[PDB]
Amino acid sequence: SYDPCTERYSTAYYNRRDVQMALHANVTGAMNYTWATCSDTINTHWHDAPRSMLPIYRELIAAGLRIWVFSGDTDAVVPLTATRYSIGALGLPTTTSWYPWYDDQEVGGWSQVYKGLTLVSVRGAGHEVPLHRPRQALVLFQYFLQGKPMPGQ
């Protein structure tokens, strides 16, 4: 059921002239380069990039915005521990200590509620959460939208 070759497909599909059409993409046929999932040039020619986002966080947190941070626990690129330590640096207070959240009868992952931020892990998901844990990723989105803590029982 899982398919690691998805990017192969997309790249195929987006390069189709009929899809571009239906998309209103590359109207003039001007883009004389193939569509790719990423641009290696941009990727490799990157400029400014502050070390920390923490301050924006502090700001928006004060501004009263809703802030959720999530993490697929089997990702190794930007892993869970990274996030744990980072958020921890905000020094926020806890409103709800780390608890398991459920989807029906399973543990979907874990969650901790701080004063001004909600942190959520998705058990068994890689970097692309909605790809590896589609059902649970959707639950996550709904609670976020309702501004409601991930569910116990």
Partner 1 sequence: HAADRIARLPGQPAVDFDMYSGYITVDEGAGRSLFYLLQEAPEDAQPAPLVLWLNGGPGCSSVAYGASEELGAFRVKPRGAGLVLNEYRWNKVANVLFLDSPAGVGFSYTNTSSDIYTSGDNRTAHDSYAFLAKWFERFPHYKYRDFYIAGESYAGHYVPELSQLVHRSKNPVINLKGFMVGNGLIDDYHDYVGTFEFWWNHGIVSDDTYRRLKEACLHDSFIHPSPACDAATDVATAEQGNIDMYSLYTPVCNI
Binds partner 1 (CB under 8 A): choice among 65, 95, 115, 148: 65
Q: Are 110 and 102 in contact (CB under 8 A)?
A: no
- Cβ at position 149, least distance to partner 1 in Å: 14
- Three-state secondary-structure class, residue 21: helix
Draw the binding track, 93-132, toward partner 1 (x: CB under 8 A; -: no contact).
Answer: ----xxxx-x--xxx-xx-x--------x-xxxxxxxxxx
Query: Any catalytic annotation for residue 40?
Result: no
The CA dihedral of 102, 78, 74, 11, to the nearest 10 degrees, is: 100
Binds partner 1 (CB under 8 A): choice among 29, 34, 38, 149: 38
Query: Any catalytic annotation for residue 75?
Result: yes
Closest CA relative to residue 135, chosen from 101, 87, 90: 101
Using CB under 8 A as the binding rule, the residues of this chain from 1 to 30 that contact partner 1 are 2-16, 18-19, 22-26
Active-site residue, from 73, 103, 127, 132: 127
- In degrees rounded to 5, what are phi and psi of residue 111? -155, 150
